[PDB]
Amino acid sequence: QRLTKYTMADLVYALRHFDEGNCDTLKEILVTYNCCDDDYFNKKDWYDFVENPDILRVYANLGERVRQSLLKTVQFCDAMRDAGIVGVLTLDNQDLNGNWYDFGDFVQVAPGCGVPIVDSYYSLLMPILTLTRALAAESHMDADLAKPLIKWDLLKYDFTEERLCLFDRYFKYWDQTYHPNCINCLDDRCILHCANFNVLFSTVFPPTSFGPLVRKIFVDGVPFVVSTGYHFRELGVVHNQDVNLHSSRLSFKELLVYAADPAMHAASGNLLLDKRTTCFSVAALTNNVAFQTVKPGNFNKDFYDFAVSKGFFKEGSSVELKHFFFAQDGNAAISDYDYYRYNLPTMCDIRQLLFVVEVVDKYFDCYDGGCINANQVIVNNLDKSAGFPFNKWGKARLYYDSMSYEDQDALFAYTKRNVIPTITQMNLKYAISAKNRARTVAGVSICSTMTNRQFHQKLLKSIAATRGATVVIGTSKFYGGWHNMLKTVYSDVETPHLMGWDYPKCDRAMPNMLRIMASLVLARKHNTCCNLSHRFYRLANECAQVLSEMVMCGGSLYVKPGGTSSGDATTAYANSVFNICQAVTANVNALLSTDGNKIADKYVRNLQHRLYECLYRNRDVDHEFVDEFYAYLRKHFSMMILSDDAVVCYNSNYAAQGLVASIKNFKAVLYYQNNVFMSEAKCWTETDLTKGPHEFCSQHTMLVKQGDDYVYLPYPDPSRILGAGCFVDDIVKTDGTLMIERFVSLAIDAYPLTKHPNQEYADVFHLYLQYIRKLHDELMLTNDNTSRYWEPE
Amino acid sequence: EDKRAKVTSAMQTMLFTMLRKLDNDALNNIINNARDGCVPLNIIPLTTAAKLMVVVPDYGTYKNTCDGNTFTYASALWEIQQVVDADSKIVQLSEINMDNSPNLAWPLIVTALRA
Amino acid sequence: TSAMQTMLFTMLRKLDNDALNNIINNARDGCVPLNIIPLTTAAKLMVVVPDYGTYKNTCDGNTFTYASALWEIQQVVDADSKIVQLSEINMDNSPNLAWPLIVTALRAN
Amino acid sequence: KMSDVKCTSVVLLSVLQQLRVESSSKLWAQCVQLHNDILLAKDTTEAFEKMVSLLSVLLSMQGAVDINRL
Ligand SMILES: [Zn+2]
Ligand SMILES: [Zn+2]
């Protein structure tokens, strides 16, 4: 009696199955409990997290209400245990004031012997505990928002007892072992389990207690400050083992470890207060702040004028000059860093994450892998920056040509027993775009990339050499490759439709939990060449090096909250592990969220039933169920995946019934998984497979006649090809050889445009060939050299 | 072996230069006050850096961060030694106000020492 | 450098915009802007005029013509930083003025 | 003339960079903003107004005066 209108189930559903048109449940709850007024919903895009970030301040007003429900649940659970009651706790039996009712599934067995079943109860709540800042009260002295903040000791770095205290106060009846320090976990499943709790618990500890942990050590009697461990928001405290004090001299390897270690740079730097950003920072390494600009593109007037004389760039034409190198201002680099403000602590539904990851693993169950030695590592890009401070001396060649293979293996072995918290450097990029936004690259250091290849390269090379699988990296579009990739995804789908989607702010909002999941999946090949402790330290290093590393910008060191790094060895692959995880999650939710009794097909009805019962029960992995669910997705939701870019050929007859994910499922999943709103305006749907995917690998697809048969060809946007022709990166002004090579490559990409019905698109190819013949005569390319590129050999 | 030798020398030179700047009383105090000799790296600059750099994007931020000769940050009183603008020119404190705000190369960088 | 300036002026001549032609042509006689030419209403433009022969072709009473727009002259200050009245800038008084003069005007809507 | 105005803007901001307009952050930022607004323009009316303002930076600077030889 005297219950609220809505239940915890409605709040969780409204937040996890979010849809801007049908958001009345959420809007009413937010107004009812004074999170915001009604006028709040008249703000353009009030529900987004990227625009109008204010929504986080609004959801946070539910945080006290959410912790009150968690606390009442624990009190309820104690009462039913003492009463001898056995039963299941659900969200629709608890109202929004946290009161429990309607205990129909509860039975009595014996006084003092009851037990709550809370696996779906807490797992369903978990994603909204970080969204609504449920533990914000715990930052206050009495766990009371009306009182002062805890005067935490700056030198405290462990917080093991504090995490256990939170665990046993809010999740007291979560009957699964929690290990605050993930170093103590038995397998990878136990790391995601524990890390998910650490994400929530770590938000009430001060920001200065996280990151590298340091000690004073001596060499030849001279003191140094070095890292001897690291405190991870997700993994807890990891200590180093190979810590040697009172050494006499340092080895080359020790110099690399210390030079890369911010303990030497930050502890010795200036204190920095940077008001241009909302991100946490540690130290300035200078006395003078550096600013960085980007110059305009180098205009190739001869190409442009040549094209104008052929009818290009005329008013009213369908092909415009849209792609340019835009100049940047002084405070660009920092405004780029500041987009890391969108990476929010995100807790996952662990019962679902631990299922989805098994399905994700099935998708990579055809690739080879394992650890290779230093003399088995292939590095072609040796002109790549070695990162800060290594880049003050040279490029990767300098370190690869200095260290013996035995030393490269020794550095690798070090990272299997310790953690090296490296520094990467961010820089502005001079590149062609249709937009004036800043673009950057990540100068990931040599002390990371040199050992990441030994751990991951065998797998990355196996993935890149495999054709016909779902994750397609390194597969050429040429010689029928585009066509073969499309036939591979189309497969035997019964009623095929094509879909794609967008990942709003991916390289910045991707949470550390999914970044850990992806590195754990890629590390699953290390079974016959890596023990458990070694697999943990390698995870700790990947996390210290690319999720929570120190990033130099300008003249100072900033801390990265999360996201991806464009300079790392695995990003192109880790992003595909992620894309599959989100797509699988959307399909798991698409099926579980529908009405199981409205399904005409008994098979699917039984699949939905068993799917629920393989997530919130039956914790042990049911490999037969996973194989079955996986096979279902392969048949009705066929994916072709590249780093943050996917095409899905799906059975629309099932998607129509909610048995297969659709774009609305991706929108909901992204909203709570990456804290971003995905506009439908950036997502395409195509019903006619005569035409290919609207866009994949930034290219359009059309079916054309070739060989008295038909093939699919990719094609570029003509405005990018002409823009690329017209503006250069200032390196072809001295050597016509380079000018010809870039024009020939553009001419090849433009080739398929001659098959296009729009003559103005076809003309771009012909323009390029006449220009190239002119360049070859001045220094030959013919239409046969470009035609052979799409003819299978 | 010239590549290795040049790297070895450069690295040793860099690390030792930093050690000369790093070894001080404040550092010994933060380590000695640790329960086991271990402290977070992120609290060392707050304890051992004698100099603070403040980067301020506009006047309102300046007024609420570094108004006048001194200010408080990271539980310490700081004394401003100099203000340098984004063009690396010297700006006097008497020149930073609302009326002359449009004429300064913002952000300004304020250098201050522990009082 | 010299190549870039050659291309720039060639391209500007090809565009053949009246405002662009006016500002380049005035600059060629020593009459250049002091600031970025303003685009909005009542925004302030300052220019330098090196002699009377130039002045008589850009200024008429308190109206200044420049960059294909009219500007409302607020003040004229000479090379010795003195105020010169508009009635004093003429063919008879010119020999006694501290040329170049700075002409300050606002965009006339 | 939009394509010619945009190409001209690239050449013009590039010479301002050669002349070290980057030295003064106040002026460089203004020059970059005029430049990028030309590149993002759809209406040639606006693209030319921005070109007039950006060109005036080059004409204002002295010593390095090439127009005298036209
Ligand atoms: Zn565990
Ligand atoms: Zn291994």
Residue numbers in the entry:
A (entry chain A): 117 to 895, 907 to 920
B (entry chain B): 77 to 191
C (entry chain D): 84 to 192
D (entry chain C): 2 to 71
In the authors' words:
The nsp12 RNA-dependent RNA polymerase possesses some minimal activity on its own6, but the addition of the nsp7 and nsp8 co-factors greatly stimulates polymerase activity. Though additional viral nsp subunits are likely necessary to carry out the full repertoire of replication and transcription activities, the nsp12-nsp7-nsp8 complex so far represents the minimal complex required for nucleotide polymerization. The SARS-CoV RNA-dependent RNA polymerase resembles a cupped right hand with fingers, palm, and thumb subdomains. Although not previously predicted, the SARS-CoV nsp12 contains two metal-binding sites to which we have assigned zinc atoms.
The nsp7-nsp8 heterodimer binds to nsp12 on the polymerase thumb domain facing the NTP entry channel. The index finger–thumb interaction site also forms the nsp7-nsp8 heterodimer-binding site, with most of the contacts made between nsp12 and nsp7. The role of nsp7 and nsp8 heterodimers appears to be the stabilization of nsp12 regions involved in RNA binding while a second subunit of nsp8 also plays a crucial role in polymerase activity possibly by extending the template RNA-binding surface.
